[PDB]
DNA sequence: AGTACTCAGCAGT
DNA sequence: ACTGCTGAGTACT
């Protein structure tokens, strides 16, 4: 069950995963020959490549009720992303349906906003069936099963897509899983063709987690009168980070506010090499850019801004570099760019979350505060709890996995960790900005990548915080601990050691 | 093994 | 905004 939940998970992240790498490579292509604009769909290329190594769930079988791992409120950008998942199989159709006895009952709906649906409530919901947009809507297949499930008696699985704009400013929260519904009645009307219609209302099975849009919602309307700062940046930050809570008048704990990393006096200034690029680097470039050289000959973003993979460690464009702000290979530096808020939670002390949908590989916020040889957890005060080890180590696997999918071929195993003589620490009891209040997980839709940009010493980079999940609004941001690299986590959440290193 | 169907997702305008 | 186009997967002839 969370077995389960472990499978989707990494089910998705890595499809999304392989997405992101047929982009990097349709961008390391020039201008000229890219796929992209010319036709292209990841989603039907990574698609295709995870079922060719055996990568989707539920193959071969319609389920009825609850998809196992599938939670309220988990979200998708591709209606491809439901197949793989066995949420939704048709591509593009609204009604999905299966045999239950000689009658035929729907397994799942979507409301894309394609016909005139009506959501308004967060209890009830009209779909429109489907046909011809002119002759009447016949009563066969989808708009059938739907009819058929009333007396049946039977769940439908609900999926809201947001109103899709080609303005398409992104992906994210494309589609929302609502969750389980019952079919109660169906008529005729007359549609806007001037020939009939099918209509049918769903009402919410009781006792789900609340719907996340109802959330939103809850959440949204400027009174906010959870409100204990408007901006904890002071002013530091260029929008505000508000705090809020509404489980008590508690005022967030007190700390200097910084944007900046504070390095002791005795670590040395490096000055690093820098790239002479006039434009943009980018792979694609006749004239070659040291610092993608230096990334290892790719561009370790796409273009709107996304890590593609993990890595030991992110180069970006320095000071003294040439090019553009508005090189790909800038992307932590320009610091935070998304709506973020600390809240208190019940549980856990002070929070972070964010009130939009975050896509999957965007960057969150860097984790900011005084860098200390890890030698000086002798201050006493930040222990553990306003604290980060920066990681040393690294595992090559999840990239040879990745590399077996993409080409066929593994690099050979190979493990890192940073030698004792220094790891170093990041200090935020007293200095920090709002990585400082992100939380630790058993399951977390952040982790920690190490850039480097201002000096080149690897053993104090930057630690900049991505999603590794498409992160409904107003879910808590968590990050998990560093762990030894002998150690891995199983599918139901518990620490196992690595299999053979072979 | 072939065809009809589509609540996507692009791309040109 | 309004078009037009190529579609993956699945259900049926
Ligand atoms: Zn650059
Ligand atoms: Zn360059
Ligand atoms: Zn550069």
């Known amino acids: 069950g969370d077995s389960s939940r472990n499978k989707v998970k990494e089910t998705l992240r890595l499809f999304h995963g392989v997405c992101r790498k047929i982009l990097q490579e349709d961008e390391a292509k020039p201008e000229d020959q890219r796929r992209k604009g010319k036709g292209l769909r990841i989603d039907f290329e990574a698609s295709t490549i995870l079922k060719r190594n055996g990568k989707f769930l539920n193959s071969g079988v319609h389920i009825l009720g609850e998809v196992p791992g599938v939670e ?28 239950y006895g000689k009658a035929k009952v729907a397994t799942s709906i979507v409301a894309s906003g394609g016909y005139d649906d009506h959501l308004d409530n967060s209890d009830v919901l009209t779909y429109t069936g489907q046909g011809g947009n002119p002759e009447d809507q016949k009563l066969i297949t989808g708009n059938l099963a739907l009819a058929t499930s009333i007396e049946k008696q039977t769940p439908v699985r609900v999926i809201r897509g947001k109103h899709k704009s080609t303005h398409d400013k992104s992906k994210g929260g494309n589609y929302v899983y609502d969750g389980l519904y019952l079919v109660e009645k169906y008529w005729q009307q007359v549609g806007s063709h001037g020939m009939n219609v099918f209509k049918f209302q769903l009402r919410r099975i009781p006792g789900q987690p609340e719907l996340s849009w109802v959330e939103v919602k809850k959440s949204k309307s400027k009174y906010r009168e959870g409100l204990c700062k408007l901006d904890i940046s002071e002013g530091k930050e260029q929008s505000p980070i508000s705090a809020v ?13 910084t944007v900046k990393l504070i390095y002791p006096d005795w670590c040395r200034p490096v000055p690093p090499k820098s790239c002479c690029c006039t434009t943009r680097c980018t792979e694609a470039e006749a004239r070659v ?8 000959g790719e ?51 002070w929070g972070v979350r964010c009130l939009k949908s975050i ?48 080409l066929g071929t593994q690099a050979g195993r190979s493990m890192a960790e940073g030698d004792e003589s220094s790891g170093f620490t990041i200090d935020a009891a007293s200095k920090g900005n709002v990585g400082r209040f992100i939380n630790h997980s058993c399951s977390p839709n952040l982790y920690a990548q190490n ?20 992160i409904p609004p107003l879910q808590e941001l968590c990050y ?8 891995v986590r199983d599918s139901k959440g518990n620490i196992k050691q690595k299999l053979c290193f072979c």
């Open 289 to 296: 850019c040291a610092c993608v050289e230096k990334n290892g």
């Open 451 to 470: 850039v480097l940009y201002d000096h080149e010493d690897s053993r104090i980079p930057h630690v900049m915080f991505f999603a590794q999940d498409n």
């Open 245 to 257: 809570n509404e489980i008590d008048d508690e005022k967030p704990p007190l700390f200097t506010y």
């Open 480 to 487: 998990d601990y560093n762990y030894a690299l002998d150690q």
């Open 72 to 99: 309220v409120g988990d979200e998708f950008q591709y209606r491809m992303e439901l197949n793989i998942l066995g949420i939704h199989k048709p591509s593009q159709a609204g009604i999905d349906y299966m045999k």
């Open 359 to 406: 896509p999957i590989g965007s960057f969150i916020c860097e984790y900011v505060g005084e860098l200390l040889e890890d030698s000086e957890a002798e201050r006493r005060i930040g222990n553990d709890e306003y604290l980060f080890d920066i990681g040393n180590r690294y595992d090559n696997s999840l990239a040879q996995g990745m590399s077996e999918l993409m």
């Open 299 to 349: 561009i370790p973003y796409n273009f709107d801004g996304a890590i593609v993979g993990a890595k030991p460690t992110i180069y970006e464009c320095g000071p003294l570099c040439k090019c553009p702000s508005s090189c790909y290979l800038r992307v932590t530096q320009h610091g935070i760019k998304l709506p973020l808020e600390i809240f208190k939670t019940k549980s856990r002390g």
